[PDB]
């Protein structure tokens, strides 16, 4: 499953995730899969100049995965155009993903010691 995106073009209305209809941002490529980016999932970007389509950076893609899951990811979700695709998402949460809530570490959210001295 290949998804083409044109961030420099920023095609929202013309953004489907294909070649003739490239998405505006990588975010819209994930909203359809709910973060289900597997080996068959290949997202292409504007390119490097030499090529028409290049691979999306994992650093940016992973960040977008987090952002999308917090912003667009609600309780429910609908499928998409490419073969519909069922709710084939992961979660697990048996005795390992519990450390994400009951983290035995000293961290304070929204604190920002000397970092809050210049913004929220």
From TrEMBL:
<protein>
    <recommendedName>
        <fullName>Asparagine--tRNA ligase, cytoplasmic</fullName>
    </recommendedName>
</protein>
<feature type="compositionally biased region" description="Basic and acidic residues">
    <location>
        <begin position="1"/>
        <end position="11"/>
    </location>
</feature>
<comment type="similarity">
    <text>Belongs to the class-II aminoacyl-tRNA synthetase family.</text>
</comment>
<feature type="region of interest" description="Disordered">
    <location>
        <begin position="1"/>
        <end position="20"/>
    </location>
</feature>
